[PDB]
Write a protein that binds this ligand. Sequence first.
Ligand SMILES: N#Cc1c(-c2ccc3ccn(C[C@@H]4CCCN(Cc5ccccc5)C4)c3c2)n[nH]c1N
Ligand SMILES: N#Cc1c(-c2ccc3ccn(C[C@H]4CCCN(Cc5ccccc5)C4)c3c2)n[nH]c1N
Lengths: 220, 205
Amino acid sequence: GSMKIDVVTIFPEYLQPVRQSLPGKAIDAGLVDVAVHDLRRWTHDVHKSVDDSPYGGGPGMVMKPTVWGDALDEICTSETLLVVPTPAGYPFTQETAWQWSTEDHLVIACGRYEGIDQRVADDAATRMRVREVSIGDYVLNGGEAAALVIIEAVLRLVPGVLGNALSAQSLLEGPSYTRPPSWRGMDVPPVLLSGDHAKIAAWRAEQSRQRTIERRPDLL
Amino acid sequence: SMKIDVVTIFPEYLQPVGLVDVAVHDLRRWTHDVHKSVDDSPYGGGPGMVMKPTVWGDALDEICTSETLLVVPTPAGYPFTQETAWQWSTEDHLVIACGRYEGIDQRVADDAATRMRVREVSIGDYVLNGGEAAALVIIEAVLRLVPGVSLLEGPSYTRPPSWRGMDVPPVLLSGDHAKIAAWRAEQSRQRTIERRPDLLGFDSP
Ligand SMILES: N#Cc1c(-c2ccc3ccn(C[C@@H]4CCCN(Cc5ccccc5)C4)c3c2)n[nH]c1N
Ligand SMILES: N#Cc1c(-c2ccc3ccn(C[C@H]4CCCN(Cc5ccccc5)C4)c3c2)n[nH]c1N
């Protein structure tokens, strides 16, 4: 019904699209709150260091456990769902989005560089639910774009939060058409204007089958 | 060198965003009538509205050339993967057509395909409210590969060597490159089998 989301990142400005997406009515009805925190608030030194060289060598730096530990200590409780984007994560899917849409408090820990010292998530997992997840099989610069995707996929399932409706309606969806009935020599498929709604449903099912075979045979 | 143009009715969403440039275009600028919406009801019925091909056609005609790669985010697309990102990294010009509502009339992609290369793609098996988040993801994955710009990664550690009573795995402190490479390989294997068995040719859970 309602959800608080905290995002922790060294680039809080990158979360701006979430602010752009939130309707005033959802916030005012106390259905949702999204806070974004600069990780550097929890640094210890004058140079505001968030990263350090990896033990055992390697490319790039690793984010410091003492900084992340302090941040999450302040922001999380035992009731928090701690979400950690990572390309080494479990797959984030629509099932995941449905499961998380009923949560009361999500905290999303956005990494950069070569990620966060593993002890941060391992320690957190001894007193809260922790989920390392990936939004897809490509490489990003950090967790922030993944946070945008996760927040949208989850909040659109919370009634009234993003302004979208949830329709009554596995296989891929087939093609959709609207006015005008003819455009650049292409007519809308006549069956859609036939008023035979059993035939229309069969036509759409076959379109879905063909599209799935062509684009996502893994689903069959 | 790459130009990316993004076309959207929600340009406000996309402004986190020399070898590369990215421009965002408001689709509504190409409207045929200010008092008319870009969306209409679906032929044959359905949930939700569909974006009309007319406004899209006018916008894309102005922005694209025959050399353009037209990218259309859609949950019903081919999978967008790292191999896709490598393939697109050497393109001169990407145009990303972001839909909203229940999507874009199919004739937009079908007509464009008669004059340029078109790619309908999905960034993952979850549902979004529109193509803009997908556009951000595609841009990020592709731009980091532009010239001049199998297994899951195991865990990483940095200082201090003991933290809250949790020790960095001793092998990582050993200086022994061969033992470290072996331990890391074993960690990656274990992680991949548990989290992404599909990558190693096994059944998903
Ligand atoms: N979800 C998701 C993602 C992410 C994602 C998520 C979080 C971070 C933090 C840093 N990076 C960027 C590096 C750049 C170099 C290579 N690897 C190194 C790395 C390996 C293992 C763990 C952390 C980093 C990613 C991230 C990427 N990418 N793709 C997805 N579907
Ligand atoms: N890439 C990518 C995407 C997108 C994406 C991309 C482009 C558009 C344009 C519009 N939408 C939103 C629609 C898309 C389809 C139908 N549902 C409505 C629906 C409502 C109720 C019950 C079932 C379904 C929403 C888009 C979503 N989503 N996930 C990805 N990996």
